[model samples]
Target: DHLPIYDLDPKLEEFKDHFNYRIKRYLDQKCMIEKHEGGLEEFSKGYLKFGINTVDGATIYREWAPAAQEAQLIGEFNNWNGAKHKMEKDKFGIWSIKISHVNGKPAIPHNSKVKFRFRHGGGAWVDRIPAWIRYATFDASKFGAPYDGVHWDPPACERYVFKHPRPPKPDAPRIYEAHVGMSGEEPEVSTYREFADNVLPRIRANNYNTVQLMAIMEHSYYASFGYHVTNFFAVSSRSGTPEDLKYLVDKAHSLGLRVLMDVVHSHASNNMTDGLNGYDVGQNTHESYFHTGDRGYHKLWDSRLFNYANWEVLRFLLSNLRYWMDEFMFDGFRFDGVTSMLYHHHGINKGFTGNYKEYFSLDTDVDAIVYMMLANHLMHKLLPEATIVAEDVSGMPVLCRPVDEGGVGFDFRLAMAIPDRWIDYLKNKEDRKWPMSEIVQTLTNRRYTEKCIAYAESHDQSIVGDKTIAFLLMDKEMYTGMSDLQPASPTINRGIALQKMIHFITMALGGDGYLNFMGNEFGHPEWIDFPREGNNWSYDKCRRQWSLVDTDHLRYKYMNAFDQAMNALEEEFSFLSSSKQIVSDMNEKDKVIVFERGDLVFVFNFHPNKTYKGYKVGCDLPGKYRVALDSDALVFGGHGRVGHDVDHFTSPEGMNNRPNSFKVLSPPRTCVAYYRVD
Candidate 1:
């Protein structure tokens, strides 16, 4: 009853038998190594073993790296030497060594970083640390020269502390997803502290209750956006110190925001020399941790995939999950690349076809499924207040439920399609040609027993390959046309109007929790591109251009004010807990979506050239409804077409609405929402 070391997933029976047969065949040929004392546990198991009994009370530092023929302790104490201090390999092929500090010669201190230089073969020695090692810090501007395994020691109180339990059923999380390296303005490469101090304030002001930090895990390349994780347990040294990140989170908590980091355990980074690539004697040591051959590597992303069938792999990934929650006091994680974990193809080739059989096919990774179940269970079991949001687009059923109950055991899955769908329509379709029915269907469509975080745009759209909605609309015209004093330019006008209406509708109708990328409230300019040779290694685009939002000479002010007002409307009614309905769908002509969440009545008009004189939309409550939120407000980059002072209308016997619904003429290319009987 005390947490099973392994739980056999009923869904994996057939695959398990097939896996066993493969292993048995390998054994018959005598090709593979037999399981050892610790078995493959070190490959997957992640934890910090402290207070071990040492000879003469001097500490014996032991780390697990099975692939290396030899391991050496290198740091400030050893001058980063590989050959002189190579770790001796045991019969089990586990490389290890012990350093006795004396003579007051300044050995590895509390925060000293060390890297193990190990030999793979042919005298080509590579360096790596325990994959589960936590706390990494380095400046990307200085490159990876100093990015080493750090033995962190903080002044007790300054160290991260977590007395709190796994987030208790947690509040429906409003995740503000971000990437740390490109997290600031002047952006060559920004630190975790820069984000915590700068971007977090913007998030709080925009009404985000949580910050989902991306690319926090150590990865060899910055371009992977932290998805190509090299070390599962290590925080990316590209940011500031581990304590700096801890401080950032602590400060966010004080501001009433929880932190959800991107957790990459779907596969390990395949680089054994510098990463886990040549680890363990050229792949045999932790080979069990990853896929056997071509199937193990992600073809599209060019990443090594984890093999979850091995028990050691499970322990390693699971323990790594616990480390982030317990060690860093994170509220939870936004599990990235889950589609890759769930399917062999990583959801790249198939169209899904809406077939149930397609979901439970040979490509499905049952071990990955069970691992997610156990990971989410342990996270919430330990930190009851924590929330785990899956970034999977596969529509896995019951993803937010416990595995024992036939669910995936996550708090939520990202409403990934909403932003994409909106962007596609905005970019491709003419504003007048927009199909209203499709808009409703896209926003309202979601799986059962799963919660979603809704937003029109997140960090995904603001990456280097993409442009933000604002950027898409305004483009080059924004820099020249935006003047805070008076809004006259059609480019700025269109960008501002569409931005307001887009978010207003999505937040009211999309999902339970609303997410906003940092600085997007006021419309951050430029897409994120981390430091690379192409950009001449500049930080200009990597950091958040706060000055753009601060300049009164710019029209970004209205977007910010509207964002706050959007949150105010949300607070007034708490709409996430309510229900929604589509009142009218004229498709090509006019569209109206009516829904109630809490005490709010939300109505949208996506019609291009049509504004009805007496539009009657049904509502739940009877009295006069006041225009609580209007996109047509002059301040929100609109033409102030909502009339003088906004009229409050009462219900009349027009449509079959239980006679308590209200009717008001809605403006085209605008949205009107009201508070009922308040």
Candidate 2:
């Protein structure tokens, strides 16, 4: 067993052999990738080959449909004629056909209709969309329509050229998670260009360094939120054209924000005509992209699980990751449904006991984890600065560690536990009865070395049935009390104060980085219910109300202001990356939490009606301190009971095991930060 992993996680000692087996499995896969596909760099370029390519003044199309008995290209080029251009198959069952330049130009026009007419499953003919079609669209206007796979070859003059290089990865990635479709004030979907125009600027203004764009990849179901992936290479036409997505990424780079694709490689849509469910047939002996029947299906997600054990599947997936970074210039990816990927049970009703046994057992999916290791290996190699994270709820140890050190080799994991725990209190407990030390424990609870993106509530809690932290805290009061025209509702006041306190505290203490959902930063007090049959297919709750924050005499602006201020503070002092985090005091009696993050000292008072004068808070630095930030500022909708830049001096006498201490006039339901000024 490699000693470094055990050294990093001593609890994994009993599981040494299991981790070692994983290492061997990964090494075997790595060697196989090297020997068979000419190494990962070359192997991941399957995107360059498998789908469609132009070479030698000819149009070349290739597909791995091993189970198909026969294949042919039928599209607009031949009036949907199936008999003209028959494709030949290789020993590996890879089918191919080449059409030379007709009349000194390409035969098939750009954006023409295309499909593969193939015979399988006892000689039944079927017309299916090309697996590697660069773009596909469903006409929402048409009645019970099917998706049309388009030939996406734009002439050189029309193609989008990237203007800006990728932004450097930030020390603390303040991520603004957004969905382009739901990003606007309108009742319909917003285009990529609109997101670039409206959202990118706001992300920069809010001091977020990374933009995790959800549902950019093509999916047939809009309500799926881009998870039921149909086309791996194609950009979702729901937002706009492929060129438009490129524009958004370029604009993000120019704004000095890295774009992280919320990529879904975990599963595919079950649609036969528009997806990789079974290019060959329903039941075939030859290799297919996904496992066959119920074994390959996610009962809950209603999607097809990938067969990661296959070689070509590995190439397709690896290249999918590579394609985003190389083609669209996406700086990184936030891998979706990773817990689903890593386990055989798919985390169904399975509770993690924080035991190493849960991970190293037979339930663990070896092929999936090996594929992940390869994907991570490929990303870092392709772009050394690439940022990739696991949407893993299962706290698998050594996930973010180096591959050589027996890990899956991701850069970070979602601190998913924080939001779940945070919301639990909001749902059941009163503000005054909130457990201060328990809150502190929840925020500081994480692995020793693995980085996590801390967030109060993402789309997980903001989904249709689930209520966001804001909605849970204030609910209906937000609708009436949001306008500052009258005396602010006491409920609204507590909501605003706690909103700022919760967000700021999480950023300071929860994890290495922080994330804010697109509208939830200002507490966009609505559930993100997608257009579905159950909800009357309305966009009322689907669309984001950006005007709320923009409106003058609105309390939403106050929360928005506080969000920007905290990010700006973190932008200056990267307390997130600091290892010297110490909980200076947990005044449960007063419902206050005092903690030190690097040189910055934070004190959060959660008590509904309690203020302490000259409360002694521990600090590591002995110097003259000033209030660096106060949540009680009038702009943040607080009573301004705490003064800004107030002087407080710390003495050498230790408190709470720290080397120094200071005193502050703490305000109720407010968060304050101190910095050494003199």
Q: Sum up the clashes in candidate 2.
A: 0
- Give each model a TM-score: 0.86, 0.98
How accurate locally is residue 377 in candidate 2, as Cα lDDT from 0 to 100? 87
Off by over 4 Å in 1: 1-46, 50-56, 69-72, 80-107, 119-125, 135-146, 155-171, 278-281, 285-288, 580-588, 641-649, 652-658
Residue 346 C-alpha lDDT in model 2:
92
Candidate with maximal TM-score: 2
Residue 325 accuracy (lDDT) in model 2: 87
The positional error of residue 526 in candidate 2, measured at the CA in angstroms, is: 1.7
Q: Who wins the lDDT comparison? A: 2
Q: What C-alpha lDDT, on a 0 to 100 scale, does residue 506 get in candidate 1?
A: 81
lDDT of 1 by residue, 1-678 (tens): 111111323443433444344334333322221244242223223364421113442435555555555667777666777555556766644455555656642245676667766665576776666554565555447745434567655557677664333333324556677777776666457787888788788888877677888888888777777877776666777777677777778878777778888888776666564465444453642444676577677887777777666545666676677767666788888888888888877897767665656666667676677667667656766767777888887776556665444456787878888888887887799877777778777878875346788888877787758888888878888777778776457667777877888888887778888888877888776677666788786666667777777777778888888888788677666677555444432334455555555666666766655787677666655676777888778777677777635556665555425456556667776777777544
